[PDB]
Amino acid sequence: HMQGSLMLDIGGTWLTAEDRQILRHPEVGGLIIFARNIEHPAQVRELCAAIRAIRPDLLLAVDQEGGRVQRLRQGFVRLPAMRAIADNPNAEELAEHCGWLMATEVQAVGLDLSFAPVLDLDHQRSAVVGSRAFEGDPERAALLAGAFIRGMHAAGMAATGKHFPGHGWAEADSAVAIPEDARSLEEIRRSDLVPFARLAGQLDALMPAHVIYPQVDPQPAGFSRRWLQEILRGELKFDGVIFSDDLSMAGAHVVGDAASRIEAALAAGCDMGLVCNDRASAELALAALQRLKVTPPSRLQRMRGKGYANTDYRQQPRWLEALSALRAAQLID
Ligand SMILES: CC(=O)N[C@H]1CN[C@H](CO)[C@@H](O)[C@@H]1O
């Protein structure tokens, strides 16, 4: 039988009775949290614990990269944007401290993974990449990123590189338009695809971009068996998990109904479909996974973080080194 899984979201600070009923379905493999869910660190710990009271095995995720994408804000250290870490004499050291601190904190409120870091290159072109990108030079970005990942891992967290093959060049937004990248496969392999390649080893999961690369595949990357099977698994040698990008955005609407979107997405090789912000679409997706009788991909458990979810991380020395280290660069407060 086919494999696959599904990442939901809720709309409140605590679980409504529908949220609990739907969490009980095994086809569901994770939940993602946004600003609207997050009130205080304690509140997030309670929410994680209430979710795990129902499904201890569910992956809990957040978009916490620092900079202008940081959901966990009050009670947490404000982590810089990756561009800010880019320009420092010791940016590799500051990147390791960033990833480890970010991940120790995100895990310290009972989450498993963040989707970090962004391996997209800043060409000063895409609206959505902006300061999130580590650099514009592929090898510099990738060295930096790789160190960020070393930190996450040191803290116990599985690292998730987004967005394959690269959102840097497409000058449209994936949430509203359908972004297109007309570059050749060799020009992508030479620029934007470099960090995925270099980090394919050290990455545990990847998220495809909803950009279309018509010189490679007519369909968007997350729907593309050429992008996901031939170039990624067979070529880049990637063995981790493939989280689809959010299937409620416009970059995903090329296929059709949300059930159809998750069919394309898992049939292309994604291990986990992300449906956010629409409960209706998430329930139609879920119906489709029920019908297909999916089983969770075996590798998903590899995303669950190994760090203790307590307040005891403050008394580790690596916490003081990271704090001092980061304060000196003027990244942290
Ligand atoms: C292209 C982009 O920025 N995608 C984001 C959309 N929202 C997802 C769920 O929050 C994120 O994981 C992606 O980074």
Curated annotation (Swiss-Prot):
The active site is at 175 (proton donor/acceptor), 245 (nucleophile). It is an enzyme of class 3 (hydrolase). GO terms for biological process: carbohydrate metabolic process; cell division; cell wall organization; peptidoglycan biosynthetic process; peptidoglycan turnover; regulation of cell shape; response to antibiotic. It holds the Pfam family Glyco_hydro_3. The record marks 173 as: Important for catalytic activity. It catalyses: Hydrolysis of terminal non-reducing N-acetyl-D-hexosamine residues in N-acetyl-beta-D-hexosaminides. Keywords: Antibiotic resistance, Cell cycle, Cell division, Cell shape, Cell wall biogenesis/degradation, Cytoplasm, Glycosidase, Hydrolase, Peptidoglycan synthesis. Pathway: Cell wall biogenesis; peptidoglycan recycling. Substrate binds at residues 63, 71, 132, 162-163. GO terms for cellular component: cytosol. GO terms for molecular function: beta-N-acetylglucosaminidase activity. Disruption phenotype: Deletion of this gene increases fosfomycin sensitivity. InterPro entries: Beta_hexosaminidase_bac, Glyco_hydro_3_AS, Glyco_hydro_3_N, Glyco_hydro_3_N_sf, Glycoside_hydrolase_SF, NagZ_Beta-hexosaminidase. Its EC number is 3.2.1.52. It is found in: Cytoplasm. Belongs to the glycosyl hydrolase 3 family. NagZ subfamily. Plays a role in peptidoglycan recycling by cleaving the terminal beta-1,4-linked N-acetylglucosamine (GlcNAc) from peptide-linked peptidoglycan fragments, giving rise to free GlcNAc, anhydro-N-acetylmuramic acid and anhydro-N-acetylmuramic acid-linked peptides. Contributes to intrinsic fosfomycin resistance in P.aeruginosa. Monomer. PANTHER family: BETA-HEXOSAMINIDASE, BETA-HEXOSAMINIDASE-RELATED. This is Beta-hexosaminidase. The gene is nagZ.
